[PDB]
Amino acid sequence: IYKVEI
Amino acid sequence: IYKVEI
Amino acid sequence: IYKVEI
Amino acid sequence: IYKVEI
Amino acid sequence: IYKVEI
Amino acid sequence: IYKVEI
Amino acid sequence: IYKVEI
Amino acid sequence: IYKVEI
Amino acid sequence: IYKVEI
Amino acid sequence: IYKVEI
Amino acid sequence: IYKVEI
Amino acid sequence: IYKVEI
Amino acid sequence: IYKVEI
Amino acid sequence: IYKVEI
Amino acid sequence: IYKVEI
Amino acid sequence: IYKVEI
Amino acid sequence: IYKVEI
Amino acid sequence: IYKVEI
Amino acid sequence: IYKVEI
Amino acid sequence: IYKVEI
């Protein structure tokens, strides 16, 4: 599970 | 701006 | 399952 | 703007 | 199942 | 503008 | 089943 | 700006 | 598990 | 600015 | 002026 | 499906 | 799916 | 002026 | 998925 | 002026 | 994932 | 002026 | 992950 | 003016 955010 | 994935 | 958003 | 997928 | 939206 | 599909 | 809309 | 992953 | 952030 | 990892 | 396409 | 407009 | 606009 | 694409 | 804008 | 991409 | 901006 | 990338 | 800025 | 990288 992951999240990337800019 | 984001991506979430399980 | 995933979500991408701009 | 988004995409959601299960 | 999915949804794409602009 | 969208597409939904099951 | 699906729906597309503009 | 970040990334989180398990 | 990890997190990176700027 | 950081990184954390287990 | 635009084009939209699914 | 598409639409173009000027 | 896409949109281009001027 | 823009382009968006999924 | 992407967006470009001027 | 920008570009965003996932 | 990335963003470039001027 | 910047670029961000994960 | 990185960021460059001017 | 800077660059940060993990």
Side-chain angles (χ1 to χ4, degrees):
Chain A
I1 176 174
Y2 69 99
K3 178 175 179 180
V4 287
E5 169 174 322
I6 299 182
Chain B
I1 312 134
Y2 67 83
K3 170 172 181 175
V4 175
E5 174 168 322
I6 300 174
Chain C
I1 176 174
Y2 69 99
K3 178 175 179 180
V4 287
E5 169 174 322
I6 299 182
Chain D
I1 312 134
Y2 67 83
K3 170 172 181 175
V4 175
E5 174 168 322
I6 300 174
Chain E
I1 176 174
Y2 69 99
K3 178 175 179 180
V4 287
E5 169 174 322
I6 299 182
Chain F
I1 312 134
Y2 67 83
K3 170 172 181 175
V4 175
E5 174 168 322
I6 300 174
Chain G
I1 176 174
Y2 69 99
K3 178 175 179 180
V4 287
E5 169 174 322
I6 299 182
Chain H
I1 312 134
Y2 67 83
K3 170 172 181 175
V4 175
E5 174 168 322
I6 300 174
Chain I
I1 176 174
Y2 69 99
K3 178 175 179 180
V4 287
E5 169 174 322
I6 299 182
Chain J
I1 312 134
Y2 67 83
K3 170 172 181 175
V4 175
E5 174 168 322
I6 300 174
Chain K
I1 312 134
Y2 67 83
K3 170 172 181 175
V4 175
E5 174 168 322
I6 300 174
Chain L
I1 176 174
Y2 69 99
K3 178 175 179 180
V4 287
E5 169 174 322
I6 299 182
Chain M
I1 176 174
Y2 69 99
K3 178 175 179 180
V4 287
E5 169 174 322
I6 299 182
Chain N
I1 312 134
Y2 67 83
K3 170 172 181 175
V4 175
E5 174 168 322
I6 300 174
Chain O
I1 176 174
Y2 69 99
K3 178 175 179 180
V4 287
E5 169 174 322
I6 299 182
Chain P
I1 312 134
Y2 67 83
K3 170 172 181 175
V4 175
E5 174 168 322
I6 300 174
Chain Q
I1 176 174
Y2 69 99
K3 178 175 179 180
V4 287
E5 169 174 322
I6 299 182
Chain R
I1 312 134
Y2 67 83
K3 170 172 181 175
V4 175
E5 174 168 322
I6 300 174
Chain S
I1 176 174
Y2 69 99
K3 178 175 179 180
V4 287
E5 169 174 322
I6 299 182
Chain T
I1 312 134
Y2 67 83
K3 170 172 181 175
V4 175
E5 174 168 322
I6 300 174

